[PDB]
Design a binder for these strands. Structure first.
Length: 49
DNA sequence: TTTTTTTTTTTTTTTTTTTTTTTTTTTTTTTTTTTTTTTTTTTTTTTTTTTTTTTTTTTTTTTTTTTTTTTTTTTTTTTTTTTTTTTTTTTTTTTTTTTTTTTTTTTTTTTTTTTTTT
């Protein structure tokens, strides 16, 4: 897509754990995973960084 | 009374060795130069309610090319042996403790003599 290019990382997570992500240019963040709903292997949703 | 044999330290100066003055190469050391950390404030970035039109997932059906599949023969895997490196017992050496045995040096002050340089 215009926004999405290449799949990067896959992490298994429960419904109350956080996902910390990093960017190549000295940027990161810590997000709560409650606010995103599972979907069936075909879709694009929420931009977190 | 004269004359004859032998012994060594010196005229020794030259060969060998030792001692004493020298200066190339890898290991220290002071300097400048580049990586780190803490404050001000500062426009600037960034967190969080509300509305909104959107664009991707889930009713239902289709196929085809990746999922089925069996089998030959390779070739990575494992076995034994031996070498290289790592790591730890073993040994050796050295240092400190407190009473003993031994020693060794640097300068002032004056006055007189040797001992070199000009």
């Amino acid at each position: 897509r215009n926004g999405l290019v290449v799949g990067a990382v896959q992490v298994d997570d429960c419904d109350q754990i956080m996902m910390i992500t990093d960017a190549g240019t000295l940027v990161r963040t810590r997000v709560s995973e409650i606010s995103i709903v599972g979907r069936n292997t075909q879709g694009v949703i929420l931009i977190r960084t």
